[model samples]
Target chain A: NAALNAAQEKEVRALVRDTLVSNPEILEEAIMALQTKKADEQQAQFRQALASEHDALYNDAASPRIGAKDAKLVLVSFTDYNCPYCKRFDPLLEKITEQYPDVAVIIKPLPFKGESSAKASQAVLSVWKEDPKAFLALHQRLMQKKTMLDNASIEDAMKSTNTSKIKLTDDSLKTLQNNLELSRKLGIQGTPATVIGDTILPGAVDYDQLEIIVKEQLAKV
Target chain B: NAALNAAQEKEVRALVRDTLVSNPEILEEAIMALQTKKADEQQAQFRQALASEHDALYNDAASPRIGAKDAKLVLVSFTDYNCPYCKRFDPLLEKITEQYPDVAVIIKPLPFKGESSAKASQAVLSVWKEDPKAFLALHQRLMQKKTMLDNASIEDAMKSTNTSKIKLTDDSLKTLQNNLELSRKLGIQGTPATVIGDTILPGAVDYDQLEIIVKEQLAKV
Candidate 1:
């Protein structure tokens, strides 16, 4: 239909406005309905995105890892070396890896913090690509570092792990870039985003909380 | 931390397994927590997406329209020519437009049904782009068609509206593609998905239902 003229428009608006004023709670109900529908759609979207990115999430050789390589179940973490929450959650994640012999944890380096954070990510990823064993040692050392990460801490971790001099190659930078993009694709906006199966545990969670989630995920596997 | 070796892994698994079996409800609680966290994240994601896509949605000059173009409040509909539910809900939408003269409705043609469905969208979109006055007549006629869309119905609507012979141009096809992509981006998986403000009503709703939502959205404006 054509647009309503001024007089007709005013008349209709007044009528609708009066009807709304008389039944105000209808507004709340409408919003609730919309939210419930959006929640359902969001869950579907999460499943679809997780399924579509299964390979990059679970099988990417560039990402650092812990646990059984051929495990039926997998846990994926999008982490940042400069993130305090990631540091807090690191030990719980390690315990999850140790406790679940049939599960693997893929650590994706998300370097959004700053220069030193990016450097740490590049160094760790370089070591991960070249030698998996040394990456673990360096990863532990860096996570345990008391002070803010700088060139010194990165070098110390490398030296202590007996890891060779790290090089920030094109491949390593690209790997960091890919991880950042992957986090965006997966709707992960921050660090310590833990993923198991189709579920993404949003923030830093304790050992008991992680164990329960792992057990639930293992049942599905 | 380094991954546990076979003997240590087996021992740790045995301990964790014992703890979990003795407290099985932990599994359910873990999943519930995960779902709640995800729901919160989904809401944030929805807000971010809605804000990001505001301009493309509200200011797309090529989209079909009803009501005042400069209205403070806007309603965007993702509709399909062959969708039975969209046809069923057309009258309610029409009523909404008539009643809320200050609210503009942008009808985005999502032609996912079939060839004839796509043909109707191309025709409607073409008229909306060139001559806004004639688009309404043809749109109403197509929505009112009792049977599956065919060339005859499309020709009839065009003829009734004194519309020119519809050409399926690249622009029209691209517009349809963009609308499909927009629907996916907004997580709208079905026909009759109604968008008002940041809230998306997922399916065909009755007059009262839509009116409530419109009022709620109008309040924000």
Candidate 2:
């Protein structure tokens, strides 16, 4: 079947071209099948990655946690202080904890924006380690700010939270480094990413969308 | 450099692991390189496909066109009447034609929204063939309709344009079928897709975004 003479090869090529030109739906079906396979493969890889990083995501002592202390379900949030979308997403997350009593949030600060973002993240993390209760207050103050978190903004937010300016320690640097590595592994390109259950939702998803996903995740539990 | 014994292999494996663990940036660099290469390949393929489909896109007589008849640059738009985004995109395209004197638009109707869409598209195409000038009025009327293009709505739009009820013909069906095939070849899944110069942009792009792209595309000519 593989072997063909020159005349037969010509005939075969023409036949194929004619068949495809006439019945292009065959090609469409093949393309659809390939796309479905690619989507399924991507989903499998995502699930495997989420399973492997579960402990690091849920139990990282360096990450700032809020909402119910002993909640069964946790939402992992990757945010940059300089990200406008993350600022917009702040209230939606607050609304989630307000409505869903059993859901907790773990904030994973990714300072990919610039030095200002890194400085702000380090300052916030240091305060969280010093006092966990003061974490939300400083976090909200940073998020509520209109402009990028410059030195002045960081100082202003810290001052408002009644927190002292602490120098970035080697431990804090290592923790931030690990967070960056984890984010890369999770295929997180930018801020305002949400990881709930086994899926990662990228972008500033509104309250209704988050609520529906939360309800589905709760049903599974 | 290729030669390695079992002992050397064990040493190499451990060294590789340690190096990656200590300096993870190396792996990040490799991943980034691979992603860039993949993106480059995708772009090349996209450009090649566009070049191949240039004639079918621009010179097809069945396609309804607006703006300058002797335009040097043309924007090929793939849209489904029943697609909400396409409805939203109608005015932005109209604005482009209004502002850009040398630019023209080739509206390729893709009735992917089912029977209602197919009938509406066929009717519109029939009208365009009979009187090209009436195409835009009919298009705008159809787009303005809040609900899906049902038989009644299609007839009403036709009535407004002074077009009689058009029965589905073999030629119109062939044209629509060809449009669907071309869309698949171009990797268009949903409607309100714009093909300008060497790129295909899928989604409802705003007026400012379209204007910028149009300027860039025009400069090339």
Candidate 3:
């Protein structure tokens, strides 16, 4: 990645050379145009383009209730199931939902650690497909547990939800693939990507701002 | 930009809180996940996603040309007309053209600078349209000139090439805009992008490397 910086410089130079060579007629004018600008000015524009934030829009819709209706506000979050900050904020999220039922909260599940995270996402997806409400309930339980969520643990949670009929199989793998595809499409390369209306909030968020945004949405309605 | 970063962070945290409050179902699972992963890991992943070059391919061509039809090798370069390094490489490029008459060099004009570079590109485009051979001839002269190429110099070059009637207008502006659009589509944010056959030789390439690449392309043919 560090190689990109120097690579930029090289790339820029190569562009100029090839342009002139192909359009040999522009050589004199092209060189003259270059003299008007300072090196720093040119370099700054290049860096800015490289550092744009357009990739944050790629996030999966993990929950149907999150961003489904024409709510006043939509909250999108990118979270790794195993992320500590996401775990800590669990209660705060629940409070917001309870206080303001109209505000739609969307969870974009992203696995960042390893295969374990992918498995966790698959388990969550299975629960969601079988029973969304139970899936959310089981999700809360598993988040609190904060350990490797194996098939056995998932089955146990499903049994408690009276959704023991849910079974993990090759079909479950297909569901996981669909979820992963959504994640990739939304460019959720990391955890905790949150969106509120037009604004996308990336990373673990605090309670006060969260409360204010929710209230603001409610007030607008 | 710095202030925007801080404000954006605040917004992100707020959203996180809101999501957690509304979706208490996933609270326990989130909490347990947080306990397992450290805060730094979360931060690192977020930052990485923001700065990742995974989508750099978005701006690249689907299938780039390996070699030109007539030439054994093709030199594809991305260049800003105003860049000094690009200015410096003028003669070296000419040397390659002279040394390798059979080699076809394809120029992809990328204007990393602002309006001035775009104007310069228009001038080059006119020259190419009027007389490709003359454009190539004068290209070397203009590149070697240390001073900026103003309107007078541009007109003078046009006169010398017997192309003074070909002035830059709205139609020409469209052509320049298309060039820029193409640059964006090709993922060329900076100037001086180059390719030797299928391999990208980015930046201000020297005569030695140019010689080697040209030779390699010739040998392959």
Candidate 4:
């Protein structure tokens, strides 16, 4: 689309120089226009991507959920337990679920820290395999780990949740793989990236920010 | 730098989930820290660029100047004629020049409009080349063109400024190319982009914004 070849670029440069050499005030307006155009295009593209990938993005029954199961509003979060930010995010999710009974929060674990994080996720899956009801209980226990997650931490966490462990199986690995791939596609780096409606709140946003975005989402018809 | 791999990513995700499932408030602090780190990096990069280019950007003899030659404060602006915003910008620049006797403005011409804009620029350079004293007078003539610039308007413009035309010359082209290249390097893509000390003001920002930036630059010492 860019047609300015070698010769043309030089000629235009001279002509443009002639114009600017005389009166140079249009540069700011041109730059502003370029920026505005880019911003608009980026926004439109983002909305399009979000809309097109609705099911893969917002809800897949495979993904875990909290709050009202029948809720129409959904907050999709890509998180990792080993992350301090995700450690920070635990209550905010609960607070939202508690405050708004009609909103559901989906937790998609995409471990970005190290080996300890993967095992912790596996242990939860193992507990969930036996009884899906104990998933949240196990989730809460592991979140309580103040230091590096290890075999000891997981065992300790399980005792509280009354949950257990096993190595990753194909079916579970498929689910985890999908989450990791989706996070990359969505450009979700690190933990606690929240998507409520159209907004993607990067990092572990505060409770107030979460509340504001939730309200904004609810405001939309 | 980007260290995530296939197996490790999954492990970490599981671990991070354990942490987040327990304590969520850490999310806000993590978000704030990430943002502050990015902001600091961005600021440092811009300052480095500005400092590195300071000599070539300000007080160039080829670039026309308004205000005190020996002024303590220097403001460099990349501008284009036929840009309406620059028309709006004209008075603000004059006001700064008038208000702060110690401020000097370096006007760099960058014509982005069609051939007529280049022609008009050529005429201004003609006036400048013939006589630097006529720069202001010629500038007024071009700025006064309310409609799209044409040969007739340019010819009509010459009467007031006594600015004649020269077929583009090599030396003159070289000088203008330098300005155009410099403007490009400085990230000036529009009319009315101003550089005052370390601050780069883009677009037709309001008079109050102009007033504030000048004061900030003054206080920098």
Candidate 5:
């Protein structure tokens, strides 16, 4: 009944005229108002979905810890071992933690680039679950190396860190695999992603801006 | 000599090999690396163009004062009078100005939707050239009404504000409408596009984030 056709043009015109007479200003701005409302609704839905997914994947129990227990702010980094940007930001992260002793930094190793990256993530997780302090040392060492850390480099890193003493059992390997799967579910398709409180900072952010954000987040706590 | 014929696949392969040997890392991530580099270069060029053009037009002494200062942090808002989101964000701007006194918010009226919108923009600009403060006040009032300020409403606003004393000359209206032509050159296709510092904040921004950005910019000065 509401459909417009060649035959119904005159009838539609008459109806429109009646409506306009009742509310002339609304008739003038109808299209713009509708478009604005629709865009707002779409944006609201997108934000809601993003918030829900973030919370589901990155709650307190799911994330790993770093630095002292009394640290005011926790900076979580989602990165791939093979990613160039991740390696570049490694030193910046170290510098920031050193500068601000009250801040805790958590590294969430998520393999996003390729198959070799997944293997490297598994290796890092294996070491971290066994001995956290040794894992951090090996992680820094591997990042400093120029070449991409394949299976051979992972094994070398393990040997250097004396990780053979703490064996990665079959069940522990499965746990690492599950964490990688969760990373996919969270829609993290890029490396060197950071989360400071509610804000998700993507890509290799500059150290100066990062320092400011860290200080602001710490002030809140 | 390095150039290969379209038919000669073997010659092309030889040329590629020579290039790869000279730059090994480029060969390692050939296609993706080239594409990313090209995109970054293009973005840098675009930002440079925007900055230069903005300075030339707005900063020129010949241009009329549009309620913005040269030294203050300029916020160029591309908006349509008919847009609901633009109207919603109107009060937010007032709040921002009140909160951050140093920031200068300039309205760049863009008539995107239709002929009526262009006329409305011209009308507002005409009133602005006569009495800028009254124009701003009336603009806010009309926006809050949530309907198009047609001929009757415009007349009523003018009468109430005592703007009837000053005539909105034909030349003034024409100049305001003509200046709107610059929006196309700026590559803005939508309303509520704000240029804050070097970064262009597209769409309506929430008050909290806007406050932080305003404070940051103010601190820089």
Candidate 6:
């Protein structure tokens, strides 16, 4: 190892001081350069992962896609029923679909809230397993009420739909677990995460931003 | 005013308690009923105010509007130049105007963000007086820049447009003050207040909420 000796180290420190004193703005420029480099690297990493995993994220039939089936602009929504922000965001997503008919949403439920969310996740997937038509009804009923999530409430909710016929089991929980694991792999830590074009937004997003993305994405295809 | 004696009050309270114990849901129902009554009263108050003041709000030939000049669906935008959220809300409003050709926006200045905002408000209104055609460019310059809002920046921005020709004075300040007083009378407390009918939204609102109001207002007209 060519570790600097005491005299050489002192000379190196003196040289750095002289360089900074001559052009102090270089320090700021270097910091900005480093930050830009890190951002570029992170974007590249996400793109690499997206190239491989976006198929499962978008193509799989386990997740529900609203809007036109032939839509080219696909947005993946990582949602939990019990997450309050996700509750607020539910209407916003529907609004997007309404505004941009060609932009479809793939709802991927990640039940990080608790057993209530996990129960709802299983409930919807279990319903989807049999009566595909009833999935939207069951999902809406579950997402609408953030409280009263006890079996009594959930039972009464599913009672109105064919979802009531399905019983939760190991198989019912498998889809819920896949969403959880997939979210973890994608470095998502919360509900209401949005994925579009390899970017994972981790909180509540504005509708205008989504609309812009949709228009831009659609323009490409 | 005569207050009830302790014994009489206690006897009345006991009767109320007995009734409530018999039907505990009565308490919830009463609270909800009271809230509805208050909200209804507030709505009525605003509706009456809107009926009277909306003409002045959209007219007086001072406030600048975007979208169709003949559009009946007009939203009052009480905006401040330096409010961070207003910067974010600006593009949203523009997007709404773009999407809905039948809607128009009346941009009302509040000038709440210190002397800098007050100066920008004065600068834009001053320009608007001489050349209303240049308002959007002048207004955009002040609102878009998060920094460089000193006198030099204002002078430079003004020079970029026909805004440089005008000067601020007591006459120039009148419209800004009128908007401020009008906003207060409507109980609007901050920048980015969107006034549509009886609804005075106090902060940045999404396109969907605004769209619903515009459609409802259009339907009424």
Worst 10 residues of 3 chain A by lDDT: A53-62
lDDT by residue (B64-133, candidate 2, tens digit) is 9988879878889998899898899978887878788788888888977878788888887887887778
Error of 4 at B218 (Å): 23
Q: Which ten residues in a row are the worst by lDDT in model 5 chain A?
A: A55-64
Off by over 4 Å in 1: A1-15, B1-221
Give the candidate order by descending lDDT. 2, 1, 6, 4, 5, 3
TM-score of each: 0.47, 0.51, 0.36, 0.46, 0.42, 0.47
| Model 5 chain B poorest ten-residue lDDT run | B59-68
lDDT (tens digit, per residue) of candidate 5 on A41-72? 76676456456666443453424556665677
Weakest 10 consecutive residues of candidate 2 chain B by summed lDDT: B1-10
Q: Write the per-residue lDDT of candidate 2 for residues A49-73, one digit (tens) a residue.
A: 8889888999999899878979878
TM-score of 4: 0.46
Candidate 2, residue A174: Cα displacement in angstroms equals 36
Candidate 5: the clashing residue pairs are none
Docking class of 3: incorrect
Q: lDDT of model 3 at residue B22?
A: 62
In candidate 6, the residue pairs with backbone N, CA or C atoms under 3 Å apart (3 or more residues apart, or in different chains) clash, namely none
Model 3 lDDT per residue over A1-221, tens place:
43235565355444444443444445445345766566667456544432343333223333424323465555655566777777776667666766766666655456666565666666767667666666666567656766766667766765676767766445555645654565565445665666554454556668897788777756765
- Runs of candidate 2 with Cα error greater than 4 angstroms are A1-221, B1-6
Worst 10 residues of 1 chain B by lDDT: B12-21
**Runs in model 3 with CA error above 4 Å?**
A1-221, B1-69, B149-152, B156-162, B169-171
Q: What share of the reference contacts is kept in model 3? A: 0.00
Highest TM-score against the true fold, candidate: 2
> Model 1: per-residue lDDT, tens digit, B1-221?
32444565445444444443444444446558999999999999988887888877888988888887777787888889899888888777877778878777888988788788888998888888777777888888888887898887788778887885656566887888888888878777788888877788777877787788888888884
Q: Rate residue A31 of model 2 by lDDT.
A: 51
